[PDB]
Design a protein around this ligand. Structure first.
Ligand code: CD4
Ligand code: BCL
Ligand code: BPH
Ligand code: BPH
Ligand SMILES: *[C@H]1O[C@H](CO)[C@@H](O[C@@H]2O[C@@H](C)[C@H](O)[C@@H](O)[C@H]2O)[C@H](O)[C@@H]1O[C@H]1O[C@H](C(=O)O)[C@@H](O[C@H]2O[C@H](CO)[C@@H](O)[C@H](O)[C@H]2NC(C)=O)[C@H](OC(C)=O)[C@H]1OC(C)=O
Ligand code: V7N
Ligand code: V7N
Ligand code: V7N
Ligand code: V7N
Ligand code: V7N
Ligand code: CRT
Ligand code: LMT
Ligand code: FE
Lengths: 51, 273, 62, 39, 60, 336, 60, 60, 60, 60, 39, 39, 56, 60, 39, 39, 39
């Protein structure tokens, strides 16, 4: 939230002196948790062969 | 602590730079001026690697990844969190490896040895310098260097290879591979032979250069001899690194197509076009 | 039914135990010459302690 | 090596310096805790 | 207790100790600096009520 | 400008050439020694007589027939055209059987010659091992060389056992210069990037370490060859200043050293472990792990990158394909 | 405390010191220059009310 | 039991023990710091009722 | 039984034994910690009937 | 039978025997641990009527 | 190398220490079983 | 090497250091337990 | 104060010092040269109010 | 002043100097040729007001 | 080898060099603080 | 080895050269600051 | 090595060499400035 009085960010109801940015690791990279989580971002498993 | 025979060898002299100023040991290690510059660059580079790990997503050793900048930064230094750190670490690496080779030269001069070891190591430094300096310079951006990370640099190797569709068809790469494989074969034979004459079956007398020579000659048909096998091992191991440097510097700067279609010149020789 | 443990991982730790065993053996062999070390505090062995110096039987005559 | 008298003299400096370093570190944790407690 | 320095050369212990303490301190600072809560170069001016805290267990 | 020991300006020759010392039975030395001036300028000059015995003779007969089957199938595949046999040579292959045969005997043209060439090659390699083993014993030497060669044979045999364990000879390596490289690349594609196989990574570390060691050891012995360092057996039995200086160089450089003997143990193991860890990595592939990158995700090897694309849920269903099936065995008309 | 110079060669304690300080100084400057709050070369002219402050996500 | 110091040189055993304990302590701390429940640099201020718990067997 | 210590040097056997027990204990702890049922650092507070159990034989 | 200890040094044999048994035990344990039927860390509490069984039908 | 009387003195420590270790490990399994039985 | 009186003397410090260490570790575990139990 | 030159031979210091300062000057210039605010080869003519500021 | 040439061999210092100046001159010419504003081989004939300039800060 | 006299002399410069360095550093930190506080 | 009066002679040059360099560098910063301040 | 008079004469050439070099460079910079100034 921003204080309307002064254009100043409030964190947990109390002001911050400065320009607040949300911290992130390099380029917003996030560690892969699981095979299942990696697979959940992929296409579904391929359909069976036509033999 | 010193080897039982070592003390009489610990003389002054043989330095390239600095003279007596750093001409001393620390435990087993010889220091010297290039020892001091080695520790400086090693320390600065290693701590900047730890800083790269700290601002990245994980402390997992395998997954740490300090990446070069985007290609858009060209030959400039990028912002430090956007690949400029990789550039500073690369300067430390070049300083550390160069200091190591010159320190090896000072040690060899102090022992009255030939300069073979520093120059053999120069082959490896040439390959590293090709990968991060020469090839990226010829392509016009430092972002062509490989990232510093135990597995992320293997992702770079994979993707660079497939930039040429079928990197096995690179002709200098075939030579480089042949040197690496031939080196490993030759190393197994040299190790085996020396051990098998010096450690014969129980109750057998210690072998001789003649037995080694006879056996080797039944393996290859010819005698290589004692100095010959060490020349060969040096030729093979260093030639492998030199042909590696060639195979990567021609990929991109000089050849841009798939590597299989380079072989079109062989198909069109006039005797059989 | 162990989800995390798999045969490739089991093999890899089998290798690591062999490999660290092998490095120890090689470092014992490396100390058959020049050891124990001289020091102002007396002899030093490093670690592992070295294998003893070999004596070599020469070819009896020829 | 050292005489036992020299060992006693060094031990005096060594214990004193070790405890002094731990005292400075304990104050550094007092300040760090006051600023942002970790439990 | 002082006979520990008959056993060990103090000149070598001080080298080992300074090396150990140097690396340990750099480790702890970089670990904290990599954290969200103690990344004090970016967030050190936040009050302790404002500093990040990791996720709770959800209640159900 | 200082003499580098890389080339010998003055060779000497003995009017007689040395022979083999002992144990001439069940086999005999063929030929007689001669000298090569070029080989004598790289290294030692005598091109020697050679030993075979029973195992060596049989090894050559089996291995000749294997190579003859490979070459004749290559030459048949360009219609016996001898110009195309040379022009196209590195693309030519003798190719494994079709996959639907599994482990059954295939048709002769469709991989039946392949299995026959592979059988004779394998027997030839084993007989050549027996030859080397017998010759080491007859010269009263340790068996370090045949066990080094057994490690290479182990990797070679995984190109039989892994196809056996996955249940099809079609998975074997084609005999051909570029074709076996096509197989090598496709094997890594099928099994989901072999860079994440940790035994492949170990094998590479030992392959690189073998180059590191032979560069270091080769350079070390040439740097002390001015003092007889290349007479290594003498330096092992009677340590001279050449051995002392090479130990001190590495101690002062990197803080620890080997001996003139034990450096050859380091060499032996680094070479041997290249092919031994390699073989294990192959045998695990397709039997225990079918996608090495996903094994790397599971075990924490894979560095995270920001997403390059995001799929919608209907694209996750649309963009799944089919596994590859059989080729079409007809030529459809589309007239109706 | 001057007995340090009897235990150790001052010629090379002092090289070690200058080396350590130089490495440490460069590390700290490159760390701060990597940050957002203290990238002084590009944002150094901003006053403290304009200067970046890192926070966690608002976690609504 | 003091004759264990006649089997083994105490100067060597203590260096090995110091080495062992240092490696073990760092291993255990890094195991805990990798966990969810004991990621104390991020979540140390949470109450014991709030700290993460790994999932139970599902009811029938 | 004691003549075993004439065939083998107790200085070597005791270090071999310590190394064996060290490795074996670490193997068993890490195998358990990687399991679902005994990942005690995440799930140790669960009661014995709440702890994970591997799936039964299939039923149809 | 005891002539076996005259042909081979018992010191060498004992190492080979313990090596063989240790490897063989570790092989068998991890083979069982990798199975479904005998994965005792996850499913040891199931009881024999509801432990997994491999597929029956040759047909039908 | 040891005399037989030295081997005999060592043997009794080695046996006692082994059995002591096994006793401690037996309690550890008693505790672990009470917390989460594996059968 | 050591004389047995030196071995006897050194052991007394070693036992006391081991005890003092185990005591500090015991307090550390009970602090950790009361902060966040693991069973 | 002059006695540091009895510890360190000045001719062997001064060669080392020059190398350190040459590298340091090159590093600082290149860090500035490829910053946005101080890339003077391309934006040196701007004047202080027009020069980039790394706000975000 | 000239005693610098009694400290150092003038021959060496001349080779050191000329090497540094040659590399420095090459680097500076390459940096200029590699820029936009000073790529003089292609754009040298442009007048001083038509030669490129890097972008200003935004208006707000 | 330097005497305890030379060691005491050397230590005096080393202390005043350290102090002078620590003073310059503290002024630099206070300038940095007044420009952009980190707490 | 260098004599103390040689060391004293060099020290005067070395101080003066260093301080002259630092003076020139300070003027360079004054010009750079006037053209484009970094705070 | 070299005599102090031979050093003296060499220095005069090294000085005038450096001066002539600076002079050409200064003219080259003024030409460059007149063609395409960088501040
Ligand atoms: C990837 C596949 C292929 C990977 C291929 C990798 C191959 C690596 C091979 C080389 C590794 C060994 C290097 C070595 O031996 O250095 C000498 C040194 C000391 O012993 P010493 O030389 O005989 O005696 C001298 C010493 O006693 C007294 O000397 P001094 O008083 O003059 O100097 C002070 C002391 C202080 O001691 C130390 O500082 C030792 C610190 C060693 C840390 C690094 C260990 C790396 C182990 C890697 C293997 C593996 C560990 C897990 O001595 C020294 O100053 C000696 C300085 C030696 C510097 C060596 C630096 C080597 C760094 C290698 C990093 C390799 C990273 C891969 O040795 C040691 O401290 C013990 C090393 C024991 C062998 C490693 C066996 C590990 C088995 C598994 C754990 C066993 C637990 C019981
Ligand atoms: C796209 C390609 C894939 C890939 C796919 C594979 C595959 C597939 C394999 C390897 C294997 C290896 N790879 Mg890989 N590899 C890639 C990238 C790399 C890179 C790199 C810089 O990128 C490197 C350095 C390596 C390196 C290596 C080696 C460490 C290893 C082979 C060891 C050896 O000695 O083999 C050479 C030695 C032999 C083949 C032994 C042969 C011995 C026999 C006895 C010789 C018989 C000769 C006979 C008598 C005569 C023959 C006559 C003719 C038939 C006519 N790979 C990528 C990821 N790699 C092998 C391995 O072990 O994997 C785990 C393997 O099988
Ligand atoms: C030229 C033929 C082969 C060769 C030879 C060779 N290597 C050598 C030598 C020789 C003759 C030495 O004398 C020298 C030596 O002393 O060996 C003990 C060395 C050496 N070869 C080494 C390694 C090495 N060689 C390799 C390759 C090869 N070496 C070639 C194949 C590889 C490969 C292929 O990966 C590696 C890893 C070192 C053990 C040693 C050189 C040691 C050295 O330079 O030490 C000083 C520097 C450090 C201790 C650390 C520097 C840290 C940096 C400042 C920060 C890190 C930056 C780095 C780029 C990050 C990389 C991350 C990776 C995951 C990508
Ligand atoms: C430790 C791992 C490394 C290694 C080791 C290694 N290889 C080895 C050895 C060792 C230690 C040997 O001792 C052995 C050897 O002999 O070396 C010279 C060998 C060997 N490594 C070989 C190759 C090889 N090694 C490789 C790799 C490696 N080898 C690893 C890098 C590779 C690769 C990288 O792909 C290859 C291709 C061979 C040269 C050799 C084994 C030779 C062999 O088995 O030959 C069998 C015989 C034949 C194939 C038949 C040849 C027939 C000819 C056309 C003549 C026909 C004559 C006549 C018509 C018939 C007979 C008539 C009768 C009446 C007489
Ligand atoms: C010729 O026949 C082959 C073998 O069927 C066809 O290839 C099939 O399709 C490919 C996807 C696949 O790669 C391959 O494995 C195989 O599955 C090939 O495309 C040609 O197809 C035409 O003829 C087919 C044929 O087999 O007769 C015919 O198939 C249909 O008719 C047969 C006989 O009545 C019946 O058995 C099939 O089930 C039936 N298949 C389907 C899918 O309806 C194709 O007709 C159609 C509609 O597919 C023919 O295709 C065309 C376009 O004419
Ligand atoms: C994941 O699950 C998988 C892994 C799959 C499951 C499977 C697991 C498997 C297969 C496990 C196998 C386990 C095993 C098999 O053998 C386990 C065997 C373990 C053994 C043998 C333990 C022995 C311990 C002995 C000890 C501690 C001895 C201590 C002695 C001490 C302290 C005294 C020292 C001497 C002194 C003090 C005298 C000084 C005085 C002297 C000298 C004087 O006075 O002279
Ligand atoms: C995946 O599993 C995971 C998650 C990792 C979990 C599993 C973890 C596991 C398996 C842990 C195992 C832990 C373990 C097992 O044994 C741990 C065993 C630890 C032990 C033994 C600790 C002992 C410490 C002893 C100390 C500190 C002694 C200090 C002594 C001092 C200070 C005095 C020195 C002497 C002096 C001063 C006198 C000089 C006099 C002289 C010279 C004179 O008088 O001459
Ligand atoms: C940001 O993230 C991370 C980085 C991770 C955060 C963490 C950082 C950490 C952990 C930092 C730790 C810092 C530290 C720890 O102690 C820092 C300690 C620093 C210290 C002690 C500095 C001491 C400096 C002393 C100096 C300069 C002395 C100079 C002396 C001079 C000039 C005198 C020379 C003349 C002499 C002698 C006279 C000759 C006479 C002679 C010869 C005669 O008379 O003979
Ligand atoms: C990207 O931002 C990052 C980079 C990250 C930010 C951080 C940067 C950091 C940390 C910087 C640190 C800088 C630093 C720290 O100390 C820098 C230190 C600089 C110093 C000390 C410079 C000293 C220069 C000395 C000179 C020039 C001396 C010249 C002497 C001369 C000419 C005379 C010699 C004597 C003669 C000729 C005798 C003649 C007579 C004789 C012989 C007779 O009469 O006999
Ligand atoms: C992209 O922007 C980046 C690059 C990043 C920005 C950064 C830039 C930086 C940091 C630049 C640094 C510049 C620099 C220093 O630091 C520059 C220093 C320059 C200097 C000192 C030049 C000196 C030149 C001297 C010359 C040519 C002498 C010529 C003549 C001689 C010798 C005499 C010939 C006659 C002889 C010999 C015979 C004598 C008689 C005899 C013998 C007899 O009579 O016996
Ligand atoms: C007239 O004579 C001519 C001109 C034809 C002679 C010239 C011949 C020429 C030019 C030959 C050229 C040969 C070339 C270029 C060969 C290239 C070979 C390469 C590069 C091979 C590379 C890899 C091959 C591998 C790894 C093959 C492995 C095969 C194995 C392990 C097969 C094993 C098979 C077995 C054990 C079969 C057993 C039989 C069954 C299963 C049926 O029963 C047990
Ligand atoms: C929970 C812990 C359970 C107990 C742990 C095991 C250690 C018990 C030690 C205290 C009990 C007495 O333990 C006993 O000590 C004596 C000496 O004191 C050892 O005795 C040893 O030395 C004596 C001489 O001193 C020899 O005569 C004897 O043959 C030899 O074995 C015994 O081998 C051990 O059994
Ligand atoms: Fe050799």
């Amino acid at each position: 939230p921003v204080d309307p009085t002064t254009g100043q960010t409030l964190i947990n109801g109390r002001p911050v002196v400065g320009r607040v940015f949300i911290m992130r690791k390099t380029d917003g990279t996030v560690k892969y948790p699981n095979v299942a989580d990696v697979v959940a971002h992929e296409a579904l498993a391929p359909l069976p062969p036509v033999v | 602590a010193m080897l039982s025979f070592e003390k009489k060898y610990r003389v002054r002299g043989g330095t390239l730079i600095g003279g007596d100023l750093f001409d001393f040991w620390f435990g087993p290690f010889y220091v010297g001026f290039f020892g001091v510059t080695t520790i400086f660059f090693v320390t600065l580079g290693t701590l900047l690697c730890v800083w790269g790990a700290a601002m990245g997503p994980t402390w997992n050793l395998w997954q740490i990844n300090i990446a070069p900048p985007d290609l858009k930064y060209g030959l400039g230094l990028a912002p430090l969190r956007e690949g400029g750190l990789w550039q500073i670490i690369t300067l430390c690496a070049l300083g550390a490896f160069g200091s190591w080779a010159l320190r090896q030269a000072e040690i060899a001069r102090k022992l009255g040895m030939g300069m073979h070891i520093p120059w053999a190591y120069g082959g490896a430094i040439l390959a590293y310098t090709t990968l991060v300096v020469i090839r990226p310079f010829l392509l016009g951006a430092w972002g062509h260097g490989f990232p510093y990370g135990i597995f992320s640099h293997l992702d770079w190797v994979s993707n660079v290879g497939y930039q040429y569709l079928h990197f096995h068809y690179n002709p200098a790469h075939m030579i480089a591979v042949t040197f690496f494989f031939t080196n490993c074969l030759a190393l197994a034979m040299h190790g085996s032979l020396i051990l098998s004459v010096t450690n014969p079956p129980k109750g057998t007398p210690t072998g001789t250069s003649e037995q080694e020579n006879v056996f080797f000659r039944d393996l290859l048909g010819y005698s290589i001899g004692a100095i010959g096998i060490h020349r060969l091992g040096l030729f093979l191991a260093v030639g492998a690194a030199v042909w590696s440097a060639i195979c990567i510097v021609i990929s991109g700067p000089f050849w841009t197509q798939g590597w299989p279609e380079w072989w079109n010149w062989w198909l069109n020789l006039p005797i059989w076009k | 039914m162990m989800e995390y443990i798999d045969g490739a991982q089991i093999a890899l730790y089998a290798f690591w135990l062999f490999f660290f065993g092998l490095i120890i053996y090689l470092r014992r062999e490396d100390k058959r010459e020049g050891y124990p070390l001289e020091s102002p505090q007396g002899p030093r062995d490093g670690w592992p302690k070295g294998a003893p110096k070999k004596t070599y039987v020469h070819r009896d005559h020829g | 090596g050292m005489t036992e008298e020299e060992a006693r003299r060094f031990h005096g400096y060594m214990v004193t310096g070790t405890l002094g370093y731990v005292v400075v570190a304990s104050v550094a944790h007092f300040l760090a805790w006051s600023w942002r407690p970790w439990f | 207790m002082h006979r520990i320095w008959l056993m060990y050369d103090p000149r070598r212990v001080m080298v080992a100790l300074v090396g150990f303490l140097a690396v340990l301190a750099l480790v702890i600072h970089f670990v904290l600096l990599s954290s969200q809560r103690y990344s004090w170069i970016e967030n050190g001016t936040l009050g302790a009520d404002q500093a990040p805290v990791g996720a709770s267990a959800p209640a159900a | 400008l200082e003499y580098q020991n890389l080339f010998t300006r003055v060779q000497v020759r003995t009017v007689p050439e040395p022979g083999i010392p002992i144990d001439e039975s069940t086999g005999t030395r063929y030929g007689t020694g001669t000298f090569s001036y070029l080989a004598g300028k790289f290294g030692d000059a005598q091109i020697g007589p050679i030993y075979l015995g029973w195992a060596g003779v049989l090894s050559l007969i089996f291995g000749f027939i294997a190579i003859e089957i490979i070459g004749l199938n290559m030459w048949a595949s360009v219609g016996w055209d001898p110009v195309e046999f040379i022009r196209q040579l590195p693309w030519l292959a003798l190719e494994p059987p079709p996959p639907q045969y599994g482990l059954r005997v295939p048709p002769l043209n469709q991989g039946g010659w392949y299995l026959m060439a592979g059988f004779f090659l394998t027997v030839s390699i084993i007989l050549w091992w027996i030859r080397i083993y017998r010759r080491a014993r007859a010269l009263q030497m340790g068996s370090h060389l045949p066990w080094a060669f057994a490690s290479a044979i182990f990797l070679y045999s995984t190109f039989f056992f892994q196809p056996l364990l996955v249940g099809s000879w079609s998975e074997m390596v084609p005999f051909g210069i570029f074709p076996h490289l096509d197989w090598t690349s496709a094997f890594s594609i099928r099994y989901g990037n072999l860079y994440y196989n940790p035994f492949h990574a170990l094998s590479i570390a030992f392959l690189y370490g073998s180059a590191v060691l032979f560069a270091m050891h080769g350079a070390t012995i040439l740097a002390v060859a001015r003092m007889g360092g290349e007479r290594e057996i003498e330096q092992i039995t009677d340590r001279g200043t050449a051995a002392e200086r090479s130990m001190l160089f590495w101690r002062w450089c990197m803080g620890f050293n080997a001996t003139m003997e034990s450096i050859h143990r380091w060499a032996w193991w680094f070479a041997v472990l290249t092919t031994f860890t390699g073989g294990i990595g192959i045998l695990l592939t397709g039997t225990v792990v079918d996608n090495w990158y996903l094994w790397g995700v599971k075990h924490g090897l894979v560095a995270p990158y920001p997403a390059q694309n995001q799929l919608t849920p209907e694209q996750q269903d649309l963009l799944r394909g089919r596994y590859q099936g059989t080729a079409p065995d007809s030529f459809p008309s589309y007239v109706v």
